[PDB]
Design a binder for these strands. Sequence first.
RNA 1: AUAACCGCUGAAAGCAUCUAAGCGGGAAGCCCGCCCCAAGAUGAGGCCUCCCACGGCGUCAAGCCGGUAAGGACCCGGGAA
RNA 2: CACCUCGAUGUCGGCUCGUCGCAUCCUGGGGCUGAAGAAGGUCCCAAGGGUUGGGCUGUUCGCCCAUUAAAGCGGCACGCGAGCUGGGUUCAGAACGUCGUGAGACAGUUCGGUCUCUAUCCGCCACGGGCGCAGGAGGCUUGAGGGGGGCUCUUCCUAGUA
Lengths: 205, 138, 170
Amino acid sequence: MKGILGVKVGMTRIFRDDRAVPVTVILAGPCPVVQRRTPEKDGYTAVQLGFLPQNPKRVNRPLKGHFAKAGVEPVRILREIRDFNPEGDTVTVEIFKPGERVDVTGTSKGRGFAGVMKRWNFAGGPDSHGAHKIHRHPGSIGNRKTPGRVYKGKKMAGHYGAERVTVMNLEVVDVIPEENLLLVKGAVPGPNGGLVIVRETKKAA
Amino acid sequence: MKTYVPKQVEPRWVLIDAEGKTLGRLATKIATLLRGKHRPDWTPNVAMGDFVVVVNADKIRVTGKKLEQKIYTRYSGYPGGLKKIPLEKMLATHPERVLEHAVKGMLPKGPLGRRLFKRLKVYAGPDHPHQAQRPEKL
Amino acid sequence: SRIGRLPIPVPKGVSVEVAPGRVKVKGPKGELEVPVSPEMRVVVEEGVVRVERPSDERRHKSLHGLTRTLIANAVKGVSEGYSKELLIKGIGYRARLVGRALELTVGFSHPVVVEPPEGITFEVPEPTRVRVSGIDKQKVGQVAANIRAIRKPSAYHEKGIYYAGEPVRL
RNA sequence: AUAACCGCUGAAAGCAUCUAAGCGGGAAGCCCGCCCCAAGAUGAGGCCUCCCACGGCGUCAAGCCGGUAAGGACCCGGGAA
RNA sequence: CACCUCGAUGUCGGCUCGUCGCAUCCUGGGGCUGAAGAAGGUCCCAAGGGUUGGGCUGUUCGCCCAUUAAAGCGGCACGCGAGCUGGGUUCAGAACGUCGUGAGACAGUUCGGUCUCUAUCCGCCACGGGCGCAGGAGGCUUGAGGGGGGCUCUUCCUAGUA
Ligand SMILES: [Mg+2]
Ligand SMILES: [Mg+2]
Ligand SMILES: [Mg+2]
Ligand SMILES: [Mg+2]
Ligand SMILES: [Mg+2]
Ligand SMILES: [Mg+2]
Ligand SMILES: [Mg+2]
Ligand SMILES: [Mg+2]
Ligand SMILES: [Mg+2]
Ligand SMILES: [Mg+2]
Ligand SMILES: [Mg+2]
Ligand SMILES: [Mg+2]
Ligand SMILES: [Mg+2]
Ligand SMILES: [Mg+2]
Ligand SMILES: [Mg+2]
Ligand SMILES: [Mg+2]
Ligand SMILES: [Mg+2]
Ligand SMILES: [Mg+2]
Ligand SMILES: [Mg+2]
Ligand SMILES: [Mg+2]
Ligand SMILES: [Mg+2]
Ligand SMILES: [Mg+2]
Ligand SMILES: [Mg+2]
Ligand SMILES: [Mg+2]
Ligand SMILES: [Mg+2]
Ligand SMILES: [Mg+2]
Ligand SMILES: [Mg+2]
Ligand SMILES: [Mg+2]
Ligand SMILES: [Mg+2]
Ligand SMILES: [Mg+2]
Ligand SMILES: [Mg+2]
Ligand SMILES: [Mg+2]
Ligand SMILES: [Mg+2]
Ligand SMILES: [Mg+2]
Ligand SMILES: [Mg+2]
Ligand SMILES: [Mg+2]
Ligand SMILES: [Mg+2]
Ligand SMILES: [Mg+2]
Ligand SMILES: [Mg+2]
Ligand SMILES: [Mg+2]
Ligand SMILES: [Mg+2]
Ligand SMILES: [Mg+2]
Ligand SMILES: [Mg+2]
Ligand SMILES: [Mg+2]
Ligand SMILES: [Mg+2]
Ligand SMILES: [Mg+2]
Ligand SMILES: [Mg+2]
Ligand SMILES: [Mg+2]
Ligand SMILES: [Mg+2]
Ligand SMILES: [Mg+2]
Ligand SMILES: [Mg+2]
Ligand SMILES: [Mg+2]
């Protein structure tokens, strides 16, 4: 179930078959598999997949040269791939052919305390007529004596954004192995320079 | 003459089979066992009861059309968050819950009611950790 | 009066073995296992196999006939027990056959392949008539039904998969 | 896996019956599947990798005080947080 | 009817935000048809989601225009004024008709007419601090259990075939 880590680089249009193709260039660098963990001593199947190299030994003792190729532990080994057993070593952009759909998981841009209406697309109040200090307010939040309380999931204002988000079934417009670049078209979450993980699609699986 | 009251006494362990045993009928007993009400030094405020182990928990028999008709409900704090679960699915998904649940509801409520439930290790089919004793019974 | 329950089956080149829960027939055409009520004792006599009920309760009588018949079929089964007709009427409607699998074109924007289950054998003596061969009979009647169920008769005129029998109306 | 329903096999009730024993089909619904949260799941799970088994006291029960180790904070430069 | 509330349980309609019931408006699945087909009628299952924009009137409702797969009926203090509105009702001004000798009066009409910055507890949306998870740490995780989502039309091929 091929997966790979990477950083959202940017967006741009492509042109193909005399057609504009809006895409999001993600860099899916070589991912040194550092652990596997099978139903033997884990109960499932995955692949620790350390990403960006870096670390002039800000690595301390929790380092794992245990699995040979630690090639100086990477900044974010974080996240396995679950039910993926690679070409033995080092996973790269090669796992993706132009024309495959993919599921990108990202960390959506944060908006902090966002009001109902944005958080939730509420209509708020009228900007004129009666009006009165309730223009962007949520209105009523309940009934009367029964139930005499607010529902468990009542859509209200709160922190919104900066969360796990997975835009699904994205076309792979192109892949450039020379530079570990991968071009999906459109809507990958989070900011540029944020970390994402690209996976096989779930439309087929 | 003050009534006698036991000291720390013995942490007993008992093994039961389950397979073929009804359910509530077995639950009744496992409860009385859980709170040493068979012991002549029974005490309501202490918890001087046996630890019960149960194997073959999935071969619990049951009468009538209870496999289909009997339903376990669960309310999440949310709207429409009342889930309904029939015996069949439970057993097929999580046996050892069907019996655990029949005993939980037959132990008294309270902080001591709990704990007594903790002293109950229900397992699917046979097998389990055999650290302590296990004088099997009926 | 006179109940298809306590009469007696038959033998001839076929075996019968009573287990407390079921009975195994077996014959020149294969073997069948007949799950039967734990109550109700089936006994194997000379060239026959009686079935007798414990009580006379309206509930034991009901299980009696059933049990008797249920076994007998298994006996007819292991010595020729298949059949079930299947005559496909209607104009453009024809039935072919692809190896073990039966392919029939009955008016859709496509033909329907009806690959057969184990124990069952398909035959198409002429393209406008099929037959379902088997030992089971519960399976035969099922598969025969399924195949016909692909829509069919009942219509406003002779069009669709019929059994051998059933005339129809307007 | 099911609803209405459609059937197979089939007695009671010789015939017949989808049903009383059984089995098969059958819904935008139900359970999974997708997405997100989630071990305070006090039933607090797992795997990998690190530091180690001090000094006095507590004479026994669990402890008390220091330094320490792997680490971790404090402080500071910042951040689509 | 007059049982809690008159040392106060703010009253219609709109707005906002919903949530639930199913006696189902649409979509899914069915049986019957006085069902040729297409299209309907009628009853059964089904509450997952959906269920338009305008003119008139304070209106709810309803009539109407243009659409639609459909323009569903109800409950929640005729849900929701410590959330808004204040057009209606429902104080003091004024007028008409009417009634009364009169002062005045009208589920009759008319024009006007003070809607009160601070959330303690519960509840809800978010975010932490503490302790626990019996050695202490840095990573990576399983998912018990929750939540989200769930709609639908047109055209074309089949085939102008049955
Ligand atoms: Mg921000
Ligand atoms: Mg939003
Ligand atoms: Mg918008
Ligand atoms: Mg809106
Ligand atoms: Mg509006
Ligand atoms: Mg606005
Ligand atoms: Mg105002
Ligand atoms: Mg204003
Ligand atoms: Mg209020
Ligand atoms: Mg099925
Ligand atoms: Mg029949
Ligand atoms: Mg069925
Ligand atoms: Mg089925
Ligand atoms: Mg759908
Ligand atoms: Mg998670
Ligand atoms: Mg842990
Ligand atoms: Mg691991
Ligand atoms: Mg009164
Ligand atoms: Mg009175
Ligand atoms: Mg008061
Ligand atoms: Mg008050
Ligand atoms: Mg009706
Ligand atoms: Mg319908
Ligand atoms: Mg028609
Ligand atoms: Mg109809
Ligand atoms: Mg109904
Ligand atoms: Mg108006
Ligand atoms: Mg209306
Ligand atoms: Mg009106
Ligand atoms: Mg309208
Ligand atoms: Mg409503
Ligand atoms: Mg009322
Ligand atoms: Mg009201
Ligand atoms: Mg107000
Ligand atoms: Mg109001
Ligand atoms: Mg007014
Ligand atoms: Mg005003
Ligand atoms: Mg006068
Ligand atoms: Mg008045
Ligand atoms: Mg006015
Ligand atoms: Mg004025
Ligand atoms: Mg007025
Ligand atoms: Mg106020
Ligand atoms: Mg309170
Ligand atoms: Mg906390
Ligand atoms: Mg523990
Ligand atoms: Mg779950
Ligand atoms: Mg839900
Ligand atoms: Mg769910
Ligand atoms: Mg929902
Ligand atoms: Mg024409
Ligand atoms: Mg055709």
